[model samples]
Target: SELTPEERSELKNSIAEFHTYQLDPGSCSSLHAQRIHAPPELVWSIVRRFDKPQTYKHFIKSCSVEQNFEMRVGCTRDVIVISGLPANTSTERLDILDDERRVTGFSIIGGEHRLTNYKSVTTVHRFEKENRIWTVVLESYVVDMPSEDDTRMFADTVVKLNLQKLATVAEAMAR
Candidate 1:
């Protein structure tokens, strides 16, 4: 079933309230969102594991976490991207992991390609609909646009794939 217009409103407002990023020069903003039938905890569990993004991100070939036991603010992860992608390596710095607020985000500090100054935020919002847990996933990003159209194209190619793949796993885990 398609999400109702009201449900879309929920995400709009949540984005308005939670997703404002501090802009950097030559940068662009990307926000993609959806409502899915998955437990918020499950989705958050998948996204919060900074050491393990290959679970949902298709571009990752391998990942290693720094002081994973202490996955605190500022923790970092070095990831090797799959072959054929623009970038070969990406080192991410944890920017935020607000468990209480159910929000997570990261900054791409080091990478091979034009993804310099990339930062992204993902929020999991839970609400009851049809007496079932409906999780709204919002992904917002700020990145140095490779070009004017490059940002929008990468927005679809990258962020959209991530959220869709995330839904695939989340739904697969449901029933």
Candidate 2:
């Protein structure tokens, strides 16, 4: 299975309208999506958690807030990895979080193992078809490798796998 021309075009437009990223000549960007049987509320519950990424983010060993108070925008979190990965720790900032639209945007301002200037925008959509409710989660990111290296593969796998885990968890908690 591959994306149809319609699907690709819709995603391109969605990325343009929602996950817009000004790419650098040295950076690469991509999008990954997951369709879960769970409702938008359930899926967004997990995706909107900034200080609790370990709930579904398997690669994260632990996460704690670097700065607290109102967890709306500009909240920072320090992430500890589960080992055997590229980086052990990451410093990330929350850029956007919306409840009505169910969207979250975050950027890795400080991280090691070639993760430079990473910005990710994830959106959860509530779609209805044939009187059935579903949730579609899209995670798109632009990362600066600072060079034309093999860093794109890393972002690809991480986003894809994390979205998979999100589907599993959200659906498992529902029908």
Candidate 3:
């Protein structure tokens, strides 16, 4: 479903509050978000896994934890995704994991994906007075991309897809 005017405004303002990063020269970055019809906790449970993304990410065929650390920070994980031409793999290092805040941050240290020097943080927040309206936001910082609009479009599509899938899974689990 399309976002209402108020929802769009709220998302836009919320995204503006995120911390900005200095991208490398000739890089592209974007911030996108969607409102999920699920509780914050439910949404967090699915996205907080640094070692498992295939749980909800349809593009990831498989995920492997290459280096596990006691703390989520610095742990390295690789994902084999269904990609164009041939299947591709990417490796990322977890930079931050805040359970209390329901936020995960990672940097793509190595990957076959188009973007390079990619760093992203995914955060879930609940509306203070409304429990069921959860907002999931992605702040992406990449060193380079084919074009700025492409980066924006790709990020928006990925966030929308994930949130939609998440809403479906979480709503099902609630029943």
Global lDDT of each candidate: 0.80, 0.81, 0.68
Arrange candidates by TM-score, descending: 1, 2, 3
User: Candidate 2: which stretches are off by over 4 Å?
Assistant: 1-13, 67-69, 146-149
Model 2 C-alpha lDDT per residue in residues 58-132, reported as the tens digit of each score:
798888885435687998988988879877888989999989878899988886657878889999877665888
Q: Could you tell me every candidate's TM-score relative to the true structure?
A: 0.88, 0.88, 0.77
Leading candidate by TM-score: 1
- The candidate, 2 or 3, that scores higher on lDDT is 2
Candidate 3 per-residue lDDT, tens place, 67-144, comes to 434546888888888866233888989988889767787888887766557788777766644444554444444546
Q: Pick the candidate with the highest lDDT.
A: 2
**RMSD in Å for all candidates:** 2.3, 2.5, 3.5
The lDDT of model 3 is: 0.68
lDDT, model 2, position 54: 88
Model 2: lDDT equals: 0.81
